[model samples]
Target: GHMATLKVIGVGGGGNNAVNRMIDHGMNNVEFIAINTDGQALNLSKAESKIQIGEKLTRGLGAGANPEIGKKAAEESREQIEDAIQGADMVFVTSGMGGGTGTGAAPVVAKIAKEMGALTVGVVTRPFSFEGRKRQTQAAAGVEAMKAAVDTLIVIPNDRLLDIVDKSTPMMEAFKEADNVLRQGVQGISDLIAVSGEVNLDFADVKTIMSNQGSALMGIGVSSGENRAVEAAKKAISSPLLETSIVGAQGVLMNITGGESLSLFEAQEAADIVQDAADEDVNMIFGTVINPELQDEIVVTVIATGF
Candidate 1:
C-alpha cells in the first residue's frame, strides 16, 4: 500500500479538462494539478489544486493561440509552478500541444518540476490531419522541445481517434475521445503505484521503469460480466493505443481491478494474457485490486516504458 508522492498535472484548457476527467474517475494516490494562463478555465477544473499564471501579461485573458504568450505566462508563474509540484516524487505534465497555452507553457512547467527533482513525464495530444499540418508540425516541435525537460513523452495523435467516426458521429466527438484517452493514460499510471492491488506493484517498480530515457505508452481496457477478466485482457492487448510492435519496451506493468467478488484466479487470468502478449524478456509486473465499487466488471491498465 506504500506509494510515492505523484502528481498528474493538466496544463491548458484541454490539459485542464483532461485532469478534471481523471478526478471524475476517482483518481487516488496522486494530487491533481491544473495550471493555466486562462483563469476562467482554471476555475472550472476539478483538480485538487488550481494555479493561474501569466496574469500581468495575459491579464487572465487566456493564451489566444500564441505559444509565445503561453510560455511567457508560465515563465511569470514561476513561484506558483514551484508551489504546485512541491514535494512530489514524480509528476506527469499533461497538455494538448499545438495550441497556445499547451504548446507554450507545458514544457516550462515540466522544466520547473524536473529541476525540483521530481521525475517529470509528459503526456500530450497531437492535432488531427483535419486540423491541418501546421498544428501537427507545431505539436511535433512541442514534444521535441519538452523532451529535454522531462523523463519521457507519451504522444497520442488526434487523427487516429476513430475510423473517421464512420461519419455518423460528430467530428468534434473525436476530440472528446482524444481527451478521454489522454485522461485515462494519466489515471492508468497513477493507479499502477497508488492503488493497492492484491499483488503489490510498489513505487520503486514504477520509478525503475519510468526513469529510463525514452517515451512511454499506456492503454486501458474494461469489461463487465462473467468472462470480464479475459475479455478485458484481450481488448487491452489489441487496444488501438498499443500493438505488439513497440520495440525496446524494457518494462510492462499490467494492473487489474474488479469488485470484491473478483477472485485470485480471475485476476491471474488477466495478468497471464498480458504476459503472453508482451515480450518474454520484458520486465513484467502485475498488480491486482479487489474493490466493492467495481461490481461485476474488471479494469485493466497497462503501462509500457522505454517504448
Candidate 2:
C-alpha cells in the first residue's frame, strides 16, 4: 500500500466527535488524533492519540465557552501538538467552530501543522442560525484565523443542515449530517491517494490544488441507473453544506468510482460535467476507480480550490 503520511487532528469536542465518526466509517493511510482542553471528553475519543491541553491552566475542567481560554490551551500544549503531527505529509484539522475549544484551538493546530511542513487543511462548520448571533460571530472569527493558518480551508455552515434534513430528524441525527459532510471530504482525498484507480491522484495532484488556496469546496454524490454519471456530477458540486458554486475555481480534483460495469465514457461524462461547470481556464484533473463490491452504483467526489 503506497501512500503519503496523513494525519487527521480533531481539536475540541466537535472535532473529536467528527474524528470518532471518521474512525467508525474508516479510511486508509490516515492517523487520527484528538486534542482538547477537557480531559474527560478527550478520554472518550477513539483517536489513535489523545492529548489534553491546558492541563495546568484549565485544570482539565474545559474552556467554558471562552475562545481566550481555548487559545491559551493550545498555546500551552504547543509541543504536544507538534509531536502528534510529526512526519505527516498532509494533515486535516477539523472542528465545530463557535465553541470554546474548537473556535480557539483549531487555528493553532492548523498553524502548527503548516509550520511542520504538512499540507494542512482545515474543515470547520459554522454554527446554525438558531445558535445565536454570538456563536455565528465567533465562528466567522475562527474561520478567518483558520484561513491564515491552513493551506486550504473548507468551511461548512451548519445552518444549511436544516435545509437538507427532515424536521422530524433526531437532534443527534441532524448533527451527524454535518459530520458526514466532513467525513466525505476527508474520505474523498484519502481515496485519491490510497485507492489505486485508472487515473490515480497522487499527493502532488492534491497539493497542486490545495496549497495556499484559502477556502475550498468538497462534495460527494452517488447514483445508479440511467444518466447516473451526469446526475452524480451535478449533485457532487451542489453539496448542501456549501452555498457557493464551483465556477471560477482555479483548480479542481475529481474522483469517479463505480463497479466493473463502469465505462470510460461514463467517467469522462462525469468529469466533463464538473469541468464545464467551472471556469474554462480552470486546471482540472480526474481519476476513475473500479470497486468490485459496487453493483450498479457510481460515486463521484469533487474538490474545488483556489477560487
Candidate achieving the largest TM-score = 2
- Candidate 2 lDDT, tens digit per residue, 134-237? 99999889999999999988888888888877869887787787787667777787777877887778778888888888878888899999999999999898
Query: Which regions in candidate 2 have their CA more than 4 angstroms from the true location?
Result: 291-295
Give the per-residue lDDT of model 1 (tens digit) for 23-66: 87676777999999888888788987998888888888788878
Candidate 1 segments exceeding 4 Å error: 24-30, 171-173, 189-198, 224-230, 241-248, 257-280, 288-299
Which residue pairs of candidate 2 clash?
none
User: Worst lDDT window (10 residues) for model 1?
Assistant: 239-248
- lDDT (Cα atoms) of all candidates against the true structure: 0.78, 0.86
Model 1 global lDDT (CA atoms, 0 to 1): 0.78
- Report how far residue 28 has shifted in candidate 1, in Å: 4.9
List TM-scores for all candidates, in order: 0.81, 0.93
